[PDB]
Design a binder for this molecule. Structure first.
Ligand code: LLU
Ligand code: ZN
Ligand code: ZN
Ligand code: ZN
Length: 458
């Protein structure tokens, strides 16, 4: 029970308008053969072009929606649409004019390689299969045993007929065939009605401009909805592909800094920590009464503050301060410290999601509801600052004297930042900029003022 058996049944009703007469009784084995591919009884790491829903979820970074619409099918031009927004027109002889397959296949390899090189070791074509997309694969896809890249140790994803060589997404410049792609037909999952009617039940952000790329985007969106919005699996781990470790470490440093300074500046007697049920006190030495409230990361809509706080805990969330560290609510109370992931951010960790939301993949996959500026009406943006009450002592990298109004330390109060605090400030600032650029936004109660931290040095 690891791969999808080629002898598994494939429902063909969705294919019979493009392919009339198609047998009702059909396996993946017969479908792959009908698509013009020969598997040759091969136990060389590629047992099936099609994969299970579980294998698809583990490889969500590889997902590329793909749709083919007949422009006029042997004698007719085809419009090839991808979830990157690209539309290519292939003649048998972003909107691109009609061109023969030998040049279309070069564009396909370039587009996939540039989209996927920093995300995944493969491609998973996410389909809402009606026939033409499956019969078009023979024109740009080659299959065979699992291979390695000619220039590196990564698995091969592309083939070149010019050189008779194989390459990964990073080394495929000039390559013309997609090699050993994977695919999944969403229409096999058991749906009633067409793609648009199922997609529109959960999403208003993607429309139907009636082009192939619109269908491709909708197909991947419906797949993300089914796999990450309604169903949520936090047991699945994802490989490190970027700055995951530094971002996570930075997040822990900023949370401790900000919460510690808020408690020192306003002396709240109670902190209401709302969110992750596995949360730990981020400022363990603080005097404050720390109370926890369990809420898993919402993946569909942001929590209504009325449901989190009301229906009869100190009960009085108005006493002291509320900490919402990645706990996405519709409207934060005025007495809050907030970290909210901005879904609009462009990065290799943040994948496009459903209904304005995004799929943030860092160790685990978290579908996050659309960033909404109106959630922060009772608060303000948290300014950058660095605070430290530790002794001014170097212990144990070169130096240029630090001058900064935001280095809140005893040495800066005394008129000259020490070397230890300058090094810690620069480290903190790098961690802070890393967290911000990853897409996290920080918000605080309007009365927050770092001028109140200077008198903690007496
Ligand atoms: C990020 C990108 O966003 C849109 C794409 C098409 C239409 C509306 C969108 F918001 C996507 O979902 O692929
Ligand atoms: Zn390579
Ligand atoms: Zn959508
Ligand atoms: Zn110092």
């Amino acid at each position: 029970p690891t791969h999808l058996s080629v002898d598994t049944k494939f429902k063909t009703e969705g294919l019979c308008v493009d392919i009339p007469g198609i047998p009702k009784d059909m396996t993946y084995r017969r479908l792959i053969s009908m698509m013009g591919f020969k598997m040759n009884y091969q136990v060389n790491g590629y047992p099936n072009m099609f994969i299970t829903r579980e294998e698809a979820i583990r490889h969500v970074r590889a997902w590329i929606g793909f749709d083919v619409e007949g422009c006029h099918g042997t004698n007719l031009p085809l419009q090839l649409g991808f979830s990157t927004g690209v539309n290519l027109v292939a003649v048998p002889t972003l909107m691109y004019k009609g061109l023969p397959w030998n040049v279309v296949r070069i564009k396909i390899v370039q587009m996939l390689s540039d989209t996927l090189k920093n995300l995944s070791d493969r491609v998973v074509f996410v389909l809402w299969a009606h026939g033409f997309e499956l019969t078009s694969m023979k024109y740009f896809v080659k299959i065979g045993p699992e291979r390695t890249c000619c220039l590196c140790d990564r698995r091969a994803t592309c083939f070149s007929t010019a050189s008779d060589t194989y390459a990964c997404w990073h080394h495929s410049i000039g390559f013309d065939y997609v090699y050993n792609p994977f695919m999944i037909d969403v229409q096999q999952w058991g749906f009633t009605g067409n793609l648009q009617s199922n997609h529109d039940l959960y999403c208003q952000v993607h429309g139907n401009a009636h082009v192939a790329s619109c269908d491709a985007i909708m197909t991947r969106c419906l797949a993300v909805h089914e796999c990450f919005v309604k169903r949520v699996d936090w047991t699945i781990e994802y490989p490190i592909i970027g700055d995951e470790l530094k971002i996570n470490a930075a997040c822990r440093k900023v949370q401790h800094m900000v919460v510690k300074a808020a408690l020192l500046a306003d002396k709240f007697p109670v902190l209401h920590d709302i969110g992750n049920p596995k949360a730990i006190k981020c400022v363990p030495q603080a005097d404050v009464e720390w109370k926890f409230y369990d809420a898993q990361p919402c993946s569909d809509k942001a929590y209504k503050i009325e449901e989190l706080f009301y229906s009869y805990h100190s009960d009085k969330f108005t006493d002291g301060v509320c900490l919402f560290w990645n706990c996405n609510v519709d409207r934060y109370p005025a007495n809050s410290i907030v970290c909210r992931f901005d879904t609009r951010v462009l990065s290799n960790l943040n994948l496009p999601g459903c209904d304005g939301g995004s799929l943030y993949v860092n160790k685990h996959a978290f579908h996050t509801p659309a960033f909404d500026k109106s959630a922060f009406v009772n608060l303000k943006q948290l300014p950058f600052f660095y605070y430290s009450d530790s002794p001014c002592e170097s212990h144990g990298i070169d130096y240029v004297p630090l001058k900064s109004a935001t280095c809140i330390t005893r040495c800066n109060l005394g008129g000259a930042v020490c070397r230890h605090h300058a090094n810690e400030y620069r480290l903190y600032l790098d961690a802070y900029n890393m967290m911000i650029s990853a897409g996290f936004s920080l918000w605080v109660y309007k009365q927050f003022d770092t001028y109140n931290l200077w008198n903690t040095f007496t």
